[PDB]
Ligand binder design. Structure first.
Ligand SMILES: [Mg+2]
Ligand SMILES: [Zn+2]
Ligand SMILES: [Zn+2]
Lengths: 1154, 309, 49, 99, 76, 50
DNA sequence: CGTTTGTTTGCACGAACCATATGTAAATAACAATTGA
DNA sequence: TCAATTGTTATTACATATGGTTCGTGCAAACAAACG
């Protein structure tokens, strides 16, 4: 329909063109008969009828008379919806400066006139005169007088003198000035001046002037002489129950403006003294600014209550503005919400939906089926039947939802898996039943959590749910390739219990004919669930493609492992079920099943694992009792020895050998050692102390203590919690940070005295407050990351670039923090990878390194590999599929269209609550460190010069190149190198943290991306989180989206103009067709907040951060926003160009380029 | 230093002038009188003006210097007494109209008083000007202090009711009932209910609803002038069913029935108009439509139509 | 009357009584709050308090 | 709480709050991000255009569902029109190109 | 019946086209202009279309060819 | 609207001048009415139940 | 299909009764801008 | 050309004239009943 959105200054003629009439009175309603009183703010003649096709006076109440205007009242007869589209206008009797263009900081009016904002404010409020081309004899145009100077020059100059006050003077100045001559003079000054501050000021001024002149905007339009009026339905005056009326503040602001305008007209008619008229003009101005912003004027005017009136600008900006509350997010029909239960009988692809909820959500479908099947003659009859809930309505409902997916969403949607589709199964209840395996993905527990259900309506929506969101299609995390449907706690406990072996169990040693025999044996009670037995088991191997060779043998295993073997699908080795099957083992088993057999076998295997684990955890009867928390017998002795040491050291301190601080530190150290000893003794007494005999003396086996089994299997808890239960719970640190010298010796099995509980609360409340106030900033970081990378899609299949980044295992301190296997998995090689001996091509250039290639590399011990990265991709407006990689959510290469930017942002942001986090925020903001590391700007020989209070100037001289670069280095900065040395570009001169800008400028794009990814990944690894580097590289690429033209040459760019890097790349590509290029650039690096706020599309920028600045800049510059973005298309309610709408957008471009 | 408060700027610009000296106002009024006297001499000294005056006298019974001296001594008088307006304008600060608006309205009243002030009475200017300034300020409050404007007579009635209710509150102890005011006041006791029911200041749509959440009053108000989807579907189904039922009728009967109501056309036609079109008697068309309705009433032909009720 | 009614009925420090329990009633009656007119605000309270 | 259709807010033609006005759930910004991360473009569109705001869109969608024709005519959400009229209520001339 | 769509994706490919083509075929079905090419097992039109895609009986190429043939025979 | 005036004429029913606004039990809630209170304005005439 | 008789409604037309308008009284953090060293 | 301060942004009252509203009536038009 419409290809783009154009925003520009509104001329008075334009505003009059919009209007359908002039609001002349502040009256709104007649207070006895509540018909609108004309021609006021709510007028039937101006803004349209109040009732559909009903003339106000009552002479026309039929659709036939549509299109005619009455005569007794002059009201057109049409629909009432027109009230939302007609605008009015107010003819201001005195021009008023638009607040936005006057108080934008920088003030556009001030910058255009080269007048300080202070002076312009003085002029507007009638505090001082300003000359307006008032003769070229004694006073300059811009010169400002006051009452004294103006009076003095009045008698001295009658003619050739033009000094006015208020907004009329500013409008006269703006209209008199000619943009071309000022632009030329400023261009001359810029080319004939040598000063960075003045150069920048001149550059800003010339940019403003050039933008103003290229567009159709005229400076005088910045002064409002006609005020548009919002349509009445957007500022309703509806009646509330009981004769009370609810009104929007805009009505009050408009009434004030109209009142003051009419009073000024009256005063001008009466020829009042200048003082009264000047005060009235001040008041009218203030009313206009209050309407537009209700700020930027010192004191915001409040309404009847003591709360400020909501302005015209206030309704667009902010978390509560239109952009974020009603355009990016909305309330939705066909949606419900309820508590969630477990319902473990479900299959992975379905959810339990209450019958009443299903009936309410699917009402139109039920009506349609009732009409189609003839059970209801008319839709009203169908509604009556549904309300009565007649027996056949339930059958119709069951038919309707047979294969209709629904979307289940939990409150904080931290990542993609927060919304998933399910095939509903009707439940006779009121709580949604959720498959247990998806709780981890949802981060949902069953202590009162609520989940919302959304019904996809169209065929496209249903197919999207079935083929993209179905819980079966999302089993691998989109952040890392790990599975996300791993069984969590009860399933893990059941499997671990049924898999581990005892030493002397019922039925040990006997030989079985297969898993069926083992199940019969155990279930009939002739053998213990875990007795070491030999069993004939048939494995299947898929060495070549497709073929499943059967291998049979006698395996030495347990009854429980043999029983579990029945669940495993065909093409898996038996070695997987021959261990204790902890949580890690189950996850590895599921991952192997997915990587070998596919998706459907993995789903079936997961469901079977869940069922078997639940059943055998139930049969285990694993319970927790007070005796299960065993206290070490050595705890008393250890604490006694620790107290003896503490007393000894306190006496030594009393003897004057060690200061209080050193004694405190040493006491802390000895207490930590004692706590470690206590924990070790507890784990020794609780992990394997279970001792029993097998037809002999005695043997030792891993303990079956319920707490220990829960901790070891990975179901719940950890060694820290176990030691806090039985052993002493270490030392508590007061929220300040100091470690309390007296540690809490008592565990929780034995009571905590009052003081210990107080000390524990000291930290517990601190932790609770920290987690409460941590999600807010993590959510803010996620929002910024999404906004910077929202417009990023895989638009191409192969960029063809040969550039890449060399991935190597991370080692810090001689130990590997992350092996190369995990870093190069799923990424396309950029260059041919050779054996370390250069023997031959190990893998072709552009092969996607899946698990087999990674195993090959590990077996050949390849230390380094060069793979494609999203940051080095040569595509414009997107990135090729080959540079991105594997699409970790799936196994195959990334499809064309996937919105990788949002995926990366969510992957990076969703673990933020596990975090520290401000370090990542600083890294992505690209904040410079407080004391950065002065790097070697250029290569050459270093030398010193002046060293006075103006601190040392350092000169580096190239062998042949000129050396005008000298660095003013502070003396208090310790130099790493000597005076008479030679240094390389990008090397380290001083010492400190490195600013990312310097890294990019001196070492290169690969250097800065490597630095950022390594730092953020170090943070996440320290916290134990796992994120693939693709996402961080995506964020870095979005950060490096801008470049500055060092040498425009033959291109059409300026020098200081900071163009988008893609535009300059395309310009250089095209100029290559010609001979002259002369286009060179320096890649900038902006923080995510800054990079996102400086983008082509002004709608996307105005949506998320400060709206006033973006809108003012777009208006003055006359920006034209081609949508081509996720945020823009979402706002205007059109298919986003990312997913299934990518093909539609491509076809639209096809039709557009004709 | 500097300020943005408009009232402060007005107080600065107005406090420059000295208040006044007694016999100063009489002299200023004298200057105004001399200016108007100059204008009167100019108009009298125009023979055409006198001839026009004679013509208008007959009909009824059947020049810069003077103005400058008038405008001057009017700026001085008003500028001198501007402090008076503020003093008696601060009395109405919190009646729903901002302080500076009241100041300006009082200023307009003050110019009116200066124009109509008479010095020969030997009366202080302040006493005369106070009447006019209070009048202007209070009329402005009555006229443009409410979103739903109410007339001056009704505002006077409301103020009288408020004053008498306040008096009875203390003379009685708890409250006066609307009937009880029918005695202290002399109104039918139905008007008292209307006056009390007169809508108070409308609630701001941005009033934060209870519990200090981010939800405002505007988030709980629904659009009443909307058509429910079910009703629209019912209307479409009814239109289709009516089309089908009229299809199974004789061409002329279906046509006349369609015209007698606004069926998929413009305004309904009267029997006279359809007779004009069908060139048949009005009563004939009435009988035809009655027979058509009778046919439509036949069961097995309108069961769905009755289901539409 | 307006001042007293405004304080008692519509103020941050006078809330509907939590009445779903004897314990809830009693623990609400003896509640210490740092908010209200003259105190901090939940938006900018700070961790130290 | 569940809702197929019901009363719609006044200024912005959108459903109302929770279970007291019989209003619908809030498909917040983060849910929009979740849909964007998927390839679900039609689901998102119907979620924020037909199911929520398009005044002409939702009546047509209801009718279409009633006769078993699951298709939508997305149209323009009313909230965007309100935003346009509100920016234009300032001194800013914002319009739709290539009408 | 239908649980996962992995074979159909293997057929058509790219996981957005699979949605568009299935929607096209299912809409052709829903409006009374076509009939299933596979034995209907009391499935909704979407699931039937996905099953057709799985069998290889329906592709973006086949749908347009059939539409073109229907248009050409519409001349009579 | 037309094609509804026709229906009313066909079935000879009259459009009521009063619309139903009766207080109905909220959907889902199912209980027993244990108490009813009627507050009548002074001037109004009390009904039988009051 | 028209005719005679009888009944209700839509415009238009006073009358009057109250409503309106007008006049008259002598936190925290970060980032640019600006001003001053 | 630095460095500290400032601002923005994010989580009465009485009188008079006229004018509109309400109310009752009439006439012609437009239905409604019952025959021939
Ligand atoms: Mg929970
Ligand atoms: Zn009219
Ligand atoms: Zn690439």
């Amino acid at each position: 329909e419409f290809d783009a959105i154009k925003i520009a200054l509104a001329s008075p003629d334009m505003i009059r063109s919009w209007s359908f009439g002039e609001v002349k009175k502040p009256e709104t309603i007649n207070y006895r008969t509540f018909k609108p009183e004309r021609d006021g703010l709510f007028c039937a003649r101006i803004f349209g009828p109040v009732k559909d096709y009903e003339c106000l006076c009552g002479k026309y109440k039929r659709l036939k008379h549509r299109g005619v205007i009455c005569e007794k009242c002059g009201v057109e007869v049409t629909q009432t919806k027109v009230r939302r589209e007609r605008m009015g206008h107010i003819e201001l009797a005195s021009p008023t400066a638009h607040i936005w263009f006057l108080k934008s900081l920088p003030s556009r009016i001030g910058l255009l006139l080269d007048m300080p904002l202070r002076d312009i404010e003085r002029v507007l409020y009638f505090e001082s005169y300003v000359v307006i081309e008032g003769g070229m004899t004694n006073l300059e145009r811009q010169q400002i007088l006051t009452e004294e100077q103006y009076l003095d020059a009045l008698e001295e100059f009658g003619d050739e003198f033009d000094a006015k006050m208020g907004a009329e003077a500013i409008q006269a100045l703006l209209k008199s000035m000619d943009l071309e001559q000022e632009c030329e003079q400023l261009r001359e000054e810029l080319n004939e001046t040598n000063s960075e501050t003045k150069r920048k000021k001149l550059t800003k001024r010339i940019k403003l002037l050039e933008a103003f002149v290229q567009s159709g905007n005229k400076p005088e339009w910045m002064i409002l002489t006609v005020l548009p009026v919002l349509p009445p339905d957007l500022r309703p005056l509806v009646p509330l129950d009981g004769g009370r009326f609810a009104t929007s503040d805009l009505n009050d602001l408009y009434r004030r403006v109209i009142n003051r305008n009419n009073r000024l007209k009256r005063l001008l008619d009466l020829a009042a003294p200048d003082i009264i008229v000047r005060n009235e003009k001040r008041m009218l101005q203030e009313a206009v600014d209050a309407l537009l912003d209700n700020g930027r004027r010192g004191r915001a005017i409040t309404g009847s209550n003591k709360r400020p009136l909501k302005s015209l600008a206030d309704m667009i900006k902010g978390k509560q503005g239109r952009f974020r509350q009603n355009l990016l997010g909305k309330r939705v029909d066909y949606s419900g919400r309820s508590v969630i239960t477990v319902g473990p009988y479900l299959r992975l692809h379905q959810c339990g939906l209450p019958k009443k909820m299903a009936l309410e959500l699917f009402k139109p479908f039920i009506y349609g089926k009732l009409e189609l099947r003839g059970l209801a003659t008319t839709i009203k009859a169908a509604k009556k039947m549904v309300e009565r809930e007649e027996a056949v309505v339930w059958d119709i409902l069951d038919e309707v939802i047979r294969e209709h997916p629904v979307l289940l969403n939990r409150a904080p949607t931290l990542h993609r898996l927060g919304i998933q589709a399910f095939e509903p199964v009707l439940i006779e209840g009121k709580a949604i039943q959720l498959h247990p395996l998806v709780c981890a993905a949802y981060n949902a527990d069953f202590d009162g959590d609520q989940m919302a259900v959304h019904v996809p309506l169209t065929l496209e929506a249903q197919l999207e749910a079935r083929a993209l969101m179905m819980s079966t299609n999302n089993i691998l995390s989109p952040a890392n390739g790990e599975p996300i449907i791993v069984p969590s706690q009860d399933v893990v406990l059941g499997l671990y219990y049924m898999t581990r072996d005892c030493v002397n169990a019922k039925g040990e040693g006997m030989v079985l004919t297969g898993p069926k025999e083992a199940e019969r044996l155990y279930r009939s009670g002739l053998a213990s669930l875990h007795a070491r037995v030999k069993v004939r088991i048939t494995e299947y191997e898929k060495d070549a493609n497709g073929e499943l060779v059967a291998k049979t043998s006698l395996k030495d295993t347990t009854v429980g492992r043999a029983i579990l073997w029945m669940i495993v699908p065909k093409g898996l080795p038996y070695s997987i079920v021959n261990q204790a099957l902890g949580k890690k083992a189950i996850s590895k088993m599921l991952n192997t099943c997915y990587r070998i057999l596919g998706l459907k076998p993995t789903v079936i295997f997961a469901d079977q694992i869940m069922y078997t684990g639940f059943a055998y955890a139930a049969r285990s009867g694993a319970s927790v009792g007070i005796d299960d928390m065993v206290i070490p017998e050595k705890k008393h002795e250890i604490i006694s020895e620790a107290e003896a040491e503490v007393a000894e050291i306190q006496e030594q301190f009393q003897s004057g050998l060690v200061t209080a601080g050193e004694r405190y530190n040493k006491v802390i150290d000895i207490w930590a050692a004692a706590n470690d000893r206590v924990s070790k003794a507890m784990m020794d007494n609780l992990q394997t102390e279970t001792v029993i005999n097998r037809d002999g003396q005695e043997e030792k086996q891993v303990s079956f203590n319920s707490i220990y089994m829960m901790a070891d299997s990975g179901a719940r808890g950890s060694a820290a919690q176990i030691r806090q239960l039985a052993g002493m719970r270490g030392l508590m640190a007061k929220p300040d940070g100091s470690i309390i010298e007296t540690p809490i010796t008592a565990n929780f099995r034995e009571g905590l005295n009052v003081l210990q509980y107080f000390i524990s609360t000291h930290g517990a409340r601190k932790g609770l407050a920290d987690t409460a106030l941590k999600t807010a900033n993590s959510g803010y970081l996620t929002r910024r990351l999404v906004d910077v990378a929202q417009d990023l899609v895989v638009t191409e299949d192969d960029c063809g670039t040969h550039e890449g980044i060399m991935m190597t295992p991370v080692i810090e301190g001689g130990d590997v923090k992350e092996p190369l296997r995990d870093r190069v998995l799923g990424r396309v090689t950029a260059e041919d990878v050779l054996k370390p001996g250069t023997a031959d091509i190990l893998v072709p250039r552009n092969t996607l390194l899946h698990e087999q290639w990674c195993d090959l590399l590990e077996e050949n011990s390849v230390d380094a590999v060069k793979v494609r990265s999203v940051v080095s991709c040569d595509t414009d407006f997107g990135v090729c599929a080959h540079c991105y990689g594997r699409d970790l959510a799936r196994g195959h290469i990334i499809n064309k269209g996937e919105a990788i930017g949002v995926i990366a942002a969510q992957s990076i942001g969703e673990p933020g609550t596990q975090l520290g986090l401000p370090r990542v925020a600083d890294l992505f903001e690209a904040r410079r460190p407080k004391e950065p590391a002065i790097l070697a700007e250029i290569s050459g020989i270093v030398s010193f010069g002046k060293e006075t209070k103006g601190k040392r100037r350092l000169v580096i001289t190239p062998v042949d190149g000129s050396d005008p670069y000298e660095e003013m280095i502070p003396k208090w900065r310790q130099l790493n190198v000597f005076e008479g040395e030679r240094v390389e570009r990008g090397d380290v001169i001083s010492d400190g943290p490195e600013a990312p800008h310097d890294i990019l400028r001196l070492r290169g794009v690969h250097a800065v991306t490597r630095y950022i990814v390594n730092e953020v990944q170090d943070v996440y690894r320290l916290q134990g989180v796992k994120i693939n580097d693709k996402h961080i590289e995506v964020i870095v690429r979005q950060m490096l989206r801008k470049a500055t033209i060092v040498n425009a040459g033959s291109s059409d760019f300026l020098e200081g103009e900071q163009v988008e890097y893609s535009r300059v790349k395309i310009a250089n590509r095209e100029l290559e067709a010609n001979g002259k290029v002369g286009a060179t650039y320096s890649r900038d690096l902006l923080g995510i907040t800054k990079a996102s706020l400086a983008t082509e599309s002004f709608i996307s920028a105005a949506s998320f951060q400060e709206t006033t600045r973006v809108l003012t800049e777009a208006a003055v510059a006359g920006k034209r926003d081609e949508l081509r973005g996720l945020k823009e298309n979402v706002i205007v309610g059109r298919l986003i160009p990312a997913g299934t709408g990518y093909a539609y957008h491509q076809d639209r471009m096809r039709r557009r380029a004709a | 230093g500097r300020t943005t408060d408009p009232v402060r700027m007005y107080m600065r610009e107005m406090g420059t002038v000295e208040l006044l000296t007694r016999e100063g106002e009489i002299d200023i009024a004298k200057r105004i009188e001399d200016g108007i006297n100059q204008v009167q001499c100019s108009v009298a000294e125009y023979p055409e003006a006198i001839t026009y005056l004679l013509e208008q006298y007959d009909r009824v019974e059947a020049m810069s210097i003077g103005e400058a001296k008038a405008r001057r001594a009017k700026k001085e008088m008003v500028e001198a007494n501007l402090r008076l307006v503020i003093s008696i304008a601060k009395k109405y600060t919190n009646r729903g109209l901002q302080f500076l608006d009241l100041i300006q309205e009082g200023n307009i009243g003050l110019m009116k008083a200066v124009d109509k002030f008479e010095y020969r009475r030997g009366y202080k200017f302040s006493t005369y000007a106070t009447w006019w300034i209070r009048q202007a300020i209070t009329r402005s409050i009555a006229d443009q202090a409410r979103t739903i404007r109410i007339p001056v007579h009704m505002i006077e009635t409301i103020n009288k009711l408020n004053r008498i209710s306040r008096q009875m509150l203390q003379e009685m102890g708890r409250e006066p009932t609307p009937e009880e005011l029918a005695e202290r006041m002399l109104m039918p006791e139905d008007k008292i209910r209307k006056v009390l029911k007169i809508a108070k200041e409308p609630i701001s749509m941005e009033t934060p609803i209870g519990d200090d959440e981010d939800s405002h009053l505007g988030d709980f108000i629904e659009d009443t002038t909307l058509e429910l989807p079910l009703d629209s579907a019912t209307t479409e189904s009814l239109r289709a069913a009516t089309h089908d039922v009229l299809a199974g009728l004789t061409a002329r009967e279906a046509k006349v029935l369609r015209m007698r109501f606004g069926i998929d056309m413009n305004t309904d036609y009267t029997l006279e108009e359809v007779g004009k079109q069908f060139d048949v008697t009005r009563e004939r068309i009435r009988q035809i439509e009655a027979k058509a309705l009778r046919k439509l009433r036949h069961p097995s032909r309108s069961e769905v139509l009755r289901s539409f009720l | 009357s307006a001042a007293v009614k405004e304080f008692f009925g519509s103020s941050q420090l006078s809330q509907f009584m939590d009445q779903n329990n004897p314990l809830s009633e009693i623990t609400h009656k003896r509640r210490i709050s740092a908010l209200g007119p003259g105190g901090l605000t939940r938006e900018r309270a700070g961790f130290e308090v | 709480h569940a809702r197929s259709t019901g009363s719609y807010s006044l200024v912005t033609q959108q459903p109302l709050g929770g279970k007291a006005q019989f209003g619908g759930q809030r498909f917040g910004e983060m849910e929009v991000w979740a849909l964007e991360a998927y390839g679900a473009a039609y689901t998102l569109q119907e979620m924020l255009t037909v199911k929520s705001d398009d005044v002409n869109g939702r009546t047509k969608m209801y009718k279409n569902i009633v006769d078993g024709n699951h298709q939508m005519e997305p149209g323009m959400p009313e909230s965007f029109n309100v935003l346009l009229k509100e920016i234009r209520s300032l001194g800013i001339n914002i319009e739709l190109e290539d009408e | 019946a239908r649980v996962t769509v992995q074979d159909a994706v293997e057929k058509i490919g790219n996981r957005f086209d699979l949605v568009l083509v299935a929607a096209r075929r299912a809409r052709q079905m829903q409006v009374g202009g076509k009939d299933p090419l596979v034995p209907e097992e009391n499935d909704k039109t979407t699931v039937i279309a996905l099953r057709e895609i799985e069998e290889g009986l329906i592709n973006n190429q086949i749908l347009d060819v059939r539409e073109r043939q229907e248009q050409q025979e519409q001349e009579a | 609207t037309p094609e509804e005036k026709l229906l009313r004429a066909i079935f000879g029913e009259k459009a009521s001048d009063v619309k139903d606004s009766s207080l109905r039990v909220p959907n889902g809630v199912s209980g027993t009415v244990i108490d009813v209170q009627v507050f009548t304005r002074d001037g109004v005439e009390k009904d039988k139940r009051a």
